[PDB]
Amino acid sequence: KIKDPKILGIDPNVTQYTGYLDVEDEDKHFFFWTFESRNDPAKDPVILWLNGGPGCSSLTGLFFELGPSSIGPDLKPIGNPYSWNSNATVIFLDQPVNVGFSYSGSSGVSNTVAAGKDVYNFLELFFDQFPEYVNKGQDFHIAGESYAGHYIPVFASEILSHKDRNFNLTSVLIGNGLTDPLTQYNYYEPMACGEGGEPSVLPSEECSAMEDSLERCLGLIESCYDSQSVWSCVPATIYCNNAQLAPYQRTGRNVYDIRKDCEGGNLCYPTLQDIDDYLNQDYVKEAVGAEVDHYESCNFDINRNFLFAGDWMKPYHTAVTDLLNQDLPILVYAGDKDFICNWLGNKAWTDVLPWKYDEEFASQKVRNWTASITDEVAGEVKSYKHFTYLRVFNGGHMVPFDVPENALSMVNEWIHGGFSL
Amino acid sequence: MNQAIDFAQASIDSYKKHGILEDVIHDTSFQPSGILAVEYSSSAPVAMGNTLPTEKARSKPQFQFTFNKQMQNAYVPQDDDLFTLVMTDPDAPSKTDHKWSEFCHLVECDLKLLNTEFFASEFNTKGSNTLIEYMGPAPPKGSGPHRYVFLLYKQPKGVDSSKFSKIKDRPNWGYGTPATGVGKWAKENNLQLVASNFFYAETK
Numbered sequence: 001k002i003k004d005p006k007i008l009g010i011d012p013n014v015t016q017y018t019g020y021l022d023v024e025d026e027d028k029h030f031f032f033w034t035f036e037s038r039n040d041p042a043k044d045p046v047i048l049w050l051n052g053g054p055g056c057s058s059l060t061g062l063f064f065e066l067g068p069s070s071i072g073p074d075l076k077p078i079g080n081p082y083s084w085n086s087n088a089t090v091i092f093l094d095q096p097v098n099v100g101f102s103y104s105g106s107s108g109v110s111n112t113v114a115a116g117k118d119v120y121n122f123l124e125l126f127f128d129q130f131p132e133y134v135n136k137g138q139d140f141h142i143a144g145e146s147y148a149g150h151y152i153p154v155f156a157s158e159i160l161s162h163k164d165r166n167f168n169l170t171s172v173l174i175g176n177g178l179t180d181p182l183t184q185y186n187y188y189e190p191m192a193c194g195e196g197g198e199p200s201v202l203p204s205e206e207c208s209a210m211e212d213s214l215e216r217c218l219g220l221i222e223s224c225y226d227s228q229s230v231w232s233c234v235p236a237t238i239y240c241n242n243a244q245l246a247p248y249q250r251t252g253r254n255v256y257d258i259r260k261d262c263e264g265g266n267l268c269y270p271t272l273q274d275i276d277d278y279l280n281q282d283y284v285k286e287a288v289g290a291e292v293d294h295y296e297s298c299n300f301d302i303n304r305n306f307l308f309a310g311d312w313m314k315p316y317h318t319a320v321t322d323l324l325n326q327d328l329p330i331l332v333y334a335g336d337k338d339f340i341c342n343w344l345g346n347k348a349w350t351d352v353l354p355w356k357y358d359e360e361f362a363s364q365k366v367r368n369w370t371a372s373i374t375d376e377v378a379g380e381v382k383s384y385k386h387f388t389y390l391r392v393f394n395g396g397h398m399v400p401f402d403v404p405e406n407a408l409s410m411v412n413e414w415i416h417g418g419f420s421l
Numbered sequence: 422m423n424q425a426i427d428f429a430q431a432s433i434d435s436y437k438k439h440g441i442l443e444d445v446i447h448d449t450s451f452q453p454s455g456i457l458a459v460e461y462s463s464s465a466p467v468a469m470g471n472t473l474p475t476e477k478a479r480s481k482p483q484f485q486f487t488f489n490k491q492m493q494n495a496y497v498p499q500d501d502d503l504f505t506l507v508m509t510d511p512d513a514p515s516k517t518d519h520k521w522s523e524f525c526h527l528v529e530c531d532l533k534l535l536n537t538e539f540f541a542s543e544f545n546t547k548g549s550n551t552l553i554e555y556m557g558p559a560p561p562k563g564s565g566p567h568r569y570v571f572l573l574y575k576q577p578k579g580v581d582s583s584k585f586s587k588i589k590d591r592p593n594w595g596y597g598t599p600a601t602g603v604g605k606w607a608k609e610n611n612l613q614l615v616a617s618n619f620f621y622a623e624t625k
């Protein structure tokens with residue numbers, strides 16, 4: 001069922017829908033929340049937002065990062081003037097099933113490919129229910145962060161292989177994501193040892209330890225890349241994460257923001273709890289039409305499902321090559337203060353990825369990027385044709401949360417500026 | 422992504438949330454020494470709590486043991502080492518009715534590994550002895566989902582399976598009393614639990 005959640009604060013005088021879209025022939029109930037552009041919903045593009053985890057709700061991005069309202073300590077919504085629905089209608093989807101308000105009694109997904117099949121179905125049902133967001137020829141984008149670095153490329157491929165789809169895909173955005181493990185795992189040491197724009201956070205003995213185990217880890221990742229099997233990918237995940245991520249984590253430092261200490265829940269940001277409490281209120285659940293009893297930011301079971309299935313180290317980056325070769329614009333952005341999906345690693349796989357214009361791209365010189373809204377030199381860009389890599393200054397794992405204005409400048413210059421920063 | 426660093430803690434959390442430490446292992450202090458990767462087919466991996474369609478868990482699955490000297494009385498890998506692989510359902514006929522609690526699905530013994538400390542290895546099936554042949558999930562329609570738990574035990578040095586207590590039959594592992602199985606049997610045979618994985622299956 002679909003509902004009108006306007007009675008809640010969130011975004012007054014902007015139509016929106018919440019509810020479920022079902023694939024009952026598989027017992028899958030996808031919860032979503034839609035917000036129209038605060039400008040012209042008939043002209044402005046549509047954006048699908050996805051958080052990572054894997055197993056975390058997209059409502060996090062809504063209330064905590066880039067949606068129309070955030071939530072105060074008193075559980076009252078506070079309007080966000082820099083919401084991404086300023087010049088685009090946005091869709092927040094809880095996926096895979098059983099994440100957030102999305103649920104499923106029987107089935108369950110363990111890898112990205114399978115999740116891709118499900119999202120494609122959801123989108124078909126969606127644009128079927130709301131032809132208004134396609135009829136007028138609006139562009140449609142898919143944006144997400146973190147582990148969505150796995151989702152997006154695979155997801156985009158899934159939808160582009162269907163010739164009978166009832167909508168189009170204009171471009172995809174990926175912030176601080178994990179996309180090419182083999183390359184990215186090479187930059188945790190330099191990022192944690194004073195070579196990523198921040199003072200070292202690990203004692204020398206540790207940085208060296210990380211260097212020694214690097215080879216073994218990479219070899220294991222390569223092995224997973226070659227066989228794409230549990231036997232090879234799961235061990236690779238265990239060895240590398242313990243060798244390259246564990247040291248940093250043991251210092252109590254925030255894996256999402258190298259300048260902070262991890263404090264609070266399983267996600268290091270105490271405030272996330274506030275939105276969890278807001279979404280669990282009796283009147284909010286009802287107004288939204290939730291069919292699930294208790295809401296949680298992330299579902300750690302599906303998180304472990306992906307882990308123990310070997311999805312973490314798969315070579316999904318190869319999908320990016322296909323997409324780029326087909327001229328699909330792609331924006332890979334990363335805040336330079338994040339650690340677990342740092343900008344060094346993201347610039348690295350982006351500089352060596354093979355594709356028809358990999359030569360002209362590698363040649364391009366990085367230049368300064370001035371945010372339109374703030375007029376500040378907010379980062380360093382590097383782009384050629386339809387491939388762009390953006391380093392965002394003073395941004396952690398969740399860019400919009402640290403630099404909301406510059407973040408809005410980025411998405412708008414992309415969505416409205418012809419996919420070129 | 423914060424939770425994907427420590428596979429040990431991740432394992433404990435899963436065992437707790439799904440009552441594997443109390444209903445089956447009977448030890449809330451249990452610490453895994455490694456992780457047990459189990460798979461029926463490339464599309465049917467058992468990944469700590471995922472759901473699998475019954476028909477996919479029809480034949481015997483493949484196993485792999487990854488030891489990581491860090492996730493740690495303590496288990497120190499050696500060459501003489503012989504292992505026992507168990508599969509049990511503590512939700513038989515259901516998560517509530519335990520008339521047959523702990524239904525024995527599989528018990529393989531005298532298994533050896535093909536093979537700062539770290540290694541991933543499969544088992545050498547050759548000289549092993551199956552005390553209880555494999556039988557896939559077959560939960561009663563409507564009983565709800567059942568927990569299918571795989572457990573890897575290290576056998577005491579020098580003692581083969583011909584010396585372990587007999588297993589009358591499957592329901593209750595032939596102990597007669599309800600809610601009894603791997604825990605009871607593993608203790609009276611001095612087996613050392615080393616790892617565990619599990620999945621859910623249901624018949625609607």
Ligand SMILES: *[C@@H]1O[C@H](CO)[C@@H](O)[C@H](O)[C@H]1NC(C)=O
Pocket residue numbers: 038039086087412416
């Ligand atoms: C975004 O929408 C606002 C509507 O108030 C408009 O003033 C602004 O110029 C728009 N900019 C775009 C199209 O990026």
Ligand SMILES: *[C@H]1O[C@H](CO)[C@@H](O)[C@H](O)[C@H]1NC(C)=O
Pocket residue numbers: 134165166167168
């Ligand atoms: C995608 O846009 C619509 C989908 O509603 C379709 O009719 C069109 O053919 C596609 N794009 C084009 C013009 O190739």
Ligand SMILES: *[C@H]1O[C@H](CO)[C@@H](O)[C@H](O)[C@H]1NC(C)=O
Pocket residue numbers: 367368377
């Ligand atoms: C970026 O702008 C130019 C080159 O793009 C140059 O002044 C310098 O590299 C940067 N400017 C700043 C912020 O110092």
